Amino acid sequence: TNLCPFGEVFNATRFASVYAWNRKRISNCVADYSVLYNSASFSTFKCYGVSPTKLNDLCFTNVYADSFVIRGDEVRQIAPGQTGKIADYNYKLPDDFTGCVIAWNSNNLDSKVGGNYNYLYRLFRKSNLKPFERDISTEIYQAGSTPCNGVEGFNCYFPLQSYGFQPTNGVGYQPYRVVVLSFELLHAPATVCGPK
């Protein structure tokens, strides 16, 4: 019964916009991390502080699986110590991050003839996100001296822009689905373990 449900996180037919990033908590299951790294269908698989090859015989208090969609130019930004639109305003990772940043080209799934515009990103924000911060606010951004009173125009912008995901776009303007496995170990019971 209790294999860890990475199947439904990775092979999920719907992915989330990066600003409104989805986090699945993993607890009380046995996790076969081999399925993941033996796959030949991944563009990126950069792990930080931990070896995917050596943790299907280790246990942790909580594992988090964060899923979202960005363009290829931006997957480099899903990593400790990065900066830019995505790193600062959408999904930030901490400097001492422990886990795996897994990405793949999804141009076959997340593109349409006239442009798919369902996937969004926060363009403006007064300060950078803290690690694992998630802002879904649609506050009008005040760029200028005069305050906007929820009123959009000169120096007053709607804070979300849409990705223009067309099939004929160059790799890097095409969509990539990302999953970020993160691992914590407290002095509490451990419930996420490998088969060994």
């Epitope: 790294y37 033996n38 991944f42 930080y48 931990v50 070896s51 995917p52 001492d96």
Partner: antibody
């Protein structure tokens, strides 16, 4: 489980360019970060730098910044370490090692490529 | 930029006796998120690549016999061979993988004493 295989012995004159290689075979490769270690004759190990093949993210050691170039080709699972102009002092044996993560021990090692630079 | 100092440089030990090697790190190598020190031990014999013995300061890499054990915390670490075997004559390096640039100890030469 997977393994790394390096280019054969080199013998060059001072001033010659050189590019030695390190190709990985085995499943679980998309995950591996590939580093270069230098061992001079009779001396200990010195970490030179590491690359991620998937996107060519390259970190150097202070001592080898802009003295060499670590490069990659994800299509053939191959990391490269190259000099534009060899000095006699570059005479050593160069190991490539592999960690399945960045901030990971080097699980897997190449057999070593012996480079002799001498007039 | 972390620096490691091993000691001693040289170490001679009778067959079946205890060998202890010390690694002093210029700085702590403790990841907060998983309570583990990011310190590894390698064995290197003549004309051979280095072999990973121990990682996370004290976890044995698979196929490493029981007689190798690693210990320490913060900045003082130890590799220990109980029962030195003929086949243990080698150089042993400690390496930190806490932060790039990774760094090795100067190495510890281990001989059989007779």
């Amino acid at each position: 489980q997977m393994q790394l295989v390096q280019s054969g012995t080199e013998v060059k004159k001072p001033g010659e360019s050189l590019k030695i290689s390190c190709k990985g075979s085995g499943y679980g490769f998309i995950t591996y970060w590939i580093g270069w270690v230098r061992q001079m004759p009779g001396k200990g190990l010195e970490w030179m730098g590491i690359i991620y093949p998937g996107d060519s993210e390259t970190r150097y050691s202070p001592s080898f910044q802009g003295q060499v170039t670590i490069s990659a080709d994800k299509s053939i699972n191959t990391a490269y370490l190259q000099w534009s102009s060899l000095k006699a002092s570059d005479t050593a044996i160069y190991y490539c090692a592999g960690g399945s993560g960045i901030s990971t021990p080097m699980d897997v090692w190449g057999q070593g490529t012996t480079v002799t630079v001498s007039s | 930029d972390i620096q490691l100092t091993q000691s001693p440089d040289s170490l001679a030990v009778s067959l079946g006796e205890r060998a202890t090697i010390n690694c002093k790190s210029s700085q702590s190598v403790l990841y907060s998120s998983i309570n583990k020190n990011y310190l590894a031990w390698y064995q290197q014999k003549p004309g051979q690549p280095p072999k990973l013995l121990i990682y996370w300061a004290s976890t044995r890499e698979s196929g490493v016999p029981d007689r190798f054990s690693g210990s320490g915390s913060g900045t003082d670490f130890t590799l220990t061979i109980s029962s030195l075997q003929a086949e243990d004559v080698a150089v042993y390096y400690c390496q930190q993988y806490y932060s790039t640039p990774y760094t090795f100890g100067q190495g510890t030469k281990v001989e059989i004493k007779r």
